[PDB]
Design a protein around this ligand. Structure first.
Ligand SMILES: [Cl-]
Ligand SMILES: [Cl-]
Ligand SMILES: [Cl-]
Ligand SMILES: [Cl-]
Ligand SMILES: [Cl-]
Ligand SMILES: [Cl-]
Ligand SMILES: [Cl-]
Ligand SMILES: [Cl-]
Ligand SMILES: [Cl-]
Ligand SMILES: [Cl-]
Ligand SMILES: [Cl-]
Ligand SMILES: [Cl-]
Ligand SMILES: [Cl-]
Lengths: 194, 195, 195, 194, 195, 195, 194, 194
């Protein structure tokens, strides 16, 4: 438990530090024996405490106080073999999500780890079964996905929960980095010839 | 769920019994909060089991194993207020589809529930966005439509999914009954005068 | 009650199986001490349940939920000695109804049980006192009648309600069989000579 | 029990006094835990004794000695939420029943409490399942109803049986009063101009 | 007994399902040591119960409640070696009976099992010794026959009563299938040429 | 075994219900390691029991009691890669078989699954090596074929025997549906113009 | 038992004395609680002993030694309310059976007790289910019946077995007497005018 | 057991001595209470020991070490009333099997005991359910059968296992003898006239 809480605390701290989340935006979880452990709603992710996490069953009503995206996390664990999930709001990737149907990284790291990131535009993108189903089906075949104008989800598959969470965290940072590289590459080209 | 499963099971059994479908022909679905629930590809609809149905999102990858016509169902739900959809192969209606641009029932039930059934004749009519787009646009203004040489689609609009499905099923049976009445009416007339 | 329910259940299952009704088409009733017991509106007759039937008085408000044709059944019971009534939609008979003023069976069974089936063509034929009055007056002299483009009504006269209902059901099946025989007889003749 | 018997005695006395019943005509009841308590057949309603009342179940054979209209009362309790029922023979209302399909009061009291009174003309109007079904269905939507050439039924809905009975009694007196007002209004008009 | 009852039950269910009988139309029997076992009058053959069958002697009073066609069955057993008899009302075959003096199948199954089906046109065709005698004499040389405008009779000859009944039932279904094939063949030809 | 038996049972029940077979008409089989499993002669296919099936080797004596068409099934398995075979008697398709040298579906399902159905007209068509050889050679290039005046054969190719059988069954139903559509299309056209 | 045996002995003695049976021809029985008691096969009916009678159940194999017509008696008890049955061979009635489809007595006794006697001609007339069914159905509506060229059956309906047997015996003697009267009447007429 | 082993040893010795088998070719068995006792795979049949035999059930997996043709023997016992089975490789009969669809002996012994020997040519002729079904169905109507290019099977029907085995052995030797006679008869004729 101590180490696992540490992984959550670390991911929250690093996501905030890199500008992938701020304030209360974003949420993350890991698959547990009973279901999944997720961050509570409205808490400061960059400064998490053990009491800021709650276990949610894959079946039944969602405990009050859980992240509003719990319905989405639950569906992903139900339909995929995900071991951890990170939801964040990569700014550049989100901006690019209005312009692309899929994000294809130009860089090696992104091509290797993400391959291609689909951009989903369901009527509702947050805290709905609609959003949940769309995200869950996309992550059945992709490690990450973008919700147009909202944010992104990244999946961890490693056996150890702490490692799966750090894995999902890494994919999320790789996504924003790939989005930034795509933007810089395009702006440089657009500013030429020169 | 059990009740909704029952509705799918019953619709499949009844369509089969009435000769509107056989083997793995046809498919049906209902709108859900997540998107829509539809019959899987290649299953015997007259003998459906819960595992024979799957949910498909309106946005995102269409799950593997879903009905080959899922693209059409999805588009109908995207563009219309349909709460349920039934795709079947009413034999007489399909035969008449080669000869009409629209089917206008002679019987009261058909005139009341269907009014007029347009016949669409796109390049492709199955698993294609051609059919998908044409069918969806058509169902925005009509409760049912015919795809020349393929089959027909009927929509249910009631709030309860099971009721919407039964409503769609009812329109499909009304369609084939109206087509048969049209055929019988024409053949009787064609075989006369007979004093 | 169970036995009478059984009769309603069986009549619905058999009419459906024979293609005389589908979905929520048609309705049937039996005369009771209080008035009459009839199928509710919008139920699947091929799969009736006891809660799907309700009693209606000959005098007073027609209970909500009762068959939309209850006005017609009520009038028939008011004006005739009918003990049971079946309203169905025999497809071939309905197709022929547009072409005949009366259907005269060629087969012995039809000539014996039906004799002659008048075709009524009122402005309205469903849930209307038009149909109600015409149908009731017609059934005062005939065991069955056809409503042009809508369907047909057949009456049962036996004392036991379940037997009256089965009798009515039998006349309805005899009617569609006689209509089909008429059609087949005409089409065979029309396709000849063929030496 | 004492108070309830008092309500029955009072209603019988007041109905007789006002000429709504005489001799053995009429009958009344209240819904009870076991079914309903009704006046026995052929007794003098204006001078009831506790032994003149009997409880009848909503299911099964009707106890011998019960009012001949018990079958009607039973059906009303079965099909409606009636808590009490009064059957009487308002003379003017009955006379008007041959001429109207429905009685619509001109007076405020009648319009407010009765609204409109349907006139029913089933083949049989007394002690039959036919009469019972007709009356029961009418009282599902109306507080009172007239049986052409026979009499009228009025329903009480209050929780307390004594109060429901006094309520049904009041509606019955309101019906005859409204019928009398309709008659007087018509006769005055018919006798003019003058 | 149970097994024989089963055969009667199954024959009734299958004839009904195939549209060869409905309500109380038709009847069937098997030869027994005492005479023959036949369906009672007015029962729903598609839903037979053991109490719905009764034994009739070849000589003596025909028990009350026995099928109205018992006179015909009795005569067939008296004059032929029939081990079972099925009387049904194949609709297309009956329609063709008004137009043919004999029905000659075009299909192999029909040519093999039926060969030729004579059409009898007596003054009376039901419950009459007219029909009784004509039918019996006809079945002495043919496995099945048609009574113009009434129905048809098919005989079973196997030793086991249940097998004889199933054999008779099979010939009856073969007869209507052959009649339908004849009709379809003629209508297709009649609607041409169509280049 | 139970599952495979189920598939045979279901195929028989469904073919019967759809009017493609009746009594003891038709037969079906699946390829096995030893040769093939087929329905016995004279059994009611709509009501099959495990004891109603028997295995036949491709080389050696055909067991007594095996379907009379076993010679044909055997030859098909010998000469083709068929994994299952269904022989039925689709009435409209058989009627059309007298008029066509090949049946070409107008409907999409038929064009996709059948493409073209050749009509074979050998001297003999049942239990004969004539039919056996012609049918087998035909099924080497087509998924189904018609034997003029007899019936039709449809092949299943999937690896799982139960799936191959259901596939064959599906092609058989598609064949009769395509034949009916052809007939209806022609009769409607033939009865016109009708302004 | 003693009295009942007496009835059997008496009927056998009187049937023989009157020439309705001789030797071992004929047989008779009475309905018993367990089934029926019938004469054994091949015994001298005119000189019966208690050991010459055996009880047969209405269900199951027929005891060996029972009359060959037991199958017929059994069917009659099964299908009719017969309480006793007598099978005999009235000579004149049998002779007339070749010429008539039914025997209608000219005499009062015969018309009253027999009314009309049907003549049955099933392929087999003795010891077969065929004969049994024919006889049983005829006796459902008639008190006696003739089997062409074989003999006749007569039914007793009285409650007491001894009385039912004497009743069947009386009907049998009435049948032969009526047949004799019919013959004498015809011969006298045929020999005239004179 | 001793005597039965003796029968197996003897049959192996005599089959080898007469050239019907050599090395490890061939196999034989007898029906037992539990199933059948057959020679193990790859053993020297001409020099069998009790440990060279194993019992195989008619149901379930085939014990490892059993003859590769056990599947065939099993099917024969399942489908026929065979009490013993001998599989051998009669050289002349095998040579003739490429030329005939059936072997019909010219000699009395062969005609009497074999009558006619069908030649089977299934795609696979050894250790397959295909071979098993073909052989089993042929032996339902014949005492022996030839598998084109492979060898032959002969059935014993006697009650005693030892006798049934010696019976199958005799039929096998009769088959090769009949094949040799057919060959010699043909060669003599072909070498003439002379
Ligand atoms: Cl939601
Ligand atoms: Cl910038
Ligand atoms: Cl820029
Ligand atoms: Cl036509
Ligand atoms: Cl009553
Ligand atoms: Cl006054
Ligand atoms: Cl006045
Ligand atoms: Cl017998
Ligand atoms: Cl004399
Ligand atoms: Cl004389
Ligand atoms: Cl294998
Ligand atoms: Cl040599
Ligand atoms: Cl040589």
């Amino acid at each position: 438990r101590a180490r696992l809480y540490a992984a959550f605390r670390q991911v929250g701290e690093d996501l905030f530090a890199q500008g992938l989340i701020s304030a209360t935006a974003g949420n993350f979880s890991v698959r547990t024996k009973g279901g999944f452990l997720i961050t509570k709603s409205g808490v400061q992710k960059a400064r998490l405490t053990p009491e800021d996490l709650l276990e949610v069953p894959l079946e039944g009503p969602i405990p009050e106080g859980a992240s509003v995206e719990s319905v989405v996390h639950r569906e992903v664990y139900r339909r995929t073999g995900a071991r951890a999930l990170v939801h964040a709001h990569p700014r550049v990737a989100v901006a690019l999500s209005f312009h692309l149907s899929r994000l294809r990284p130009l860089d090696l790291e992104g091509q290797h780890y993400l391959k291609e990131v689909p951009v989903l535009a369901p009527k509702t993108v947050s805290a709905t079964e609609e959003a949940a189903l769309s995200v869950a089906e996309a992550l059945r075949e992709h490690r990450a996905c973008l919700l147009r104008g909202h944010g992104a989800f990244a999946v961890g598959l490693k056996e150890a929960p702490e490692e799966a969470l750090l894995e999902a965290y890494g994919l999320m940072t790789t996504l924003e980095e790939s989005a930034q590289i795509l933007l810089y590459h395009r702006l440089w080209q657009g500013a030429g010839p020169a």
